Design a protein around this ligand. Structure first.
Ligand SMILES: [Cl-]
Ligand SMILES: [Cl-]
Ligand SMILES: [Cl-]
Length: 129
């Protein structure tokens, strides 16, 4: 599923991400934009052989199992394929664990490089939330 911007903002809001660990909703929408272009089916292979999955490009190196990332962990206790669903529940629940891990949203390289410190409120402008 390719979410509309406000569609995803509303989905993220109802799933409890607005100000989760102090990150306003626009931060999450911005991260999703640059990680996946709002596409739940986004996947990308990393140089180390792990793969990023879904709307927030969650990495099999640590967070999910895909059976093809040797020596990795599965800290969200989920198949990586669950992170590709049209329903963002699994991705959101796992994201909550990731952002609580120590470095906050810096865990998402695209957030650090493209969202952090910017006017992220613009990402939820005009949205019915
Ligand atoms: Cl957009
Ligand atoms: Cl915001
Ligand atoms: Cl933080």
């Amino acid at each position: 599923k390719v979410f509309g911007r406000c569609e995803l903002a509303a989905a993220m809001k109802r799933h409890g991400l607005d100000n989760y660990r102090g990150y306003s909703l626009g931060n999450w929408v911005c991260a999703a934009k640059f990680e996946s272009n709002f596409n739940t089916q986004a996947t990308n292979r990393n140089t180390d052989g792990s793969t990023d999955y879904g709307i927030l490009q969650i990495n099999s190196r640590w967070w999910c199992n895909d059976g093809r990332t040797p020596g990795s962990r599965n800290l969200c206790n989920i198949p990586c394929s669950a992170l590709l669903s049209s329903d963002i529940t699994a991705s959101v629940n796992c994201a909550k664990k990731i952002v609580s891990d120590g470095n906050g949203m810096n865990a998402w390289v695209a957030w650090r490089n493209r969202c952090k410190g910017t006017d992220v409120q613009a990402w939820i402008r005009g949205c019915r939330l």
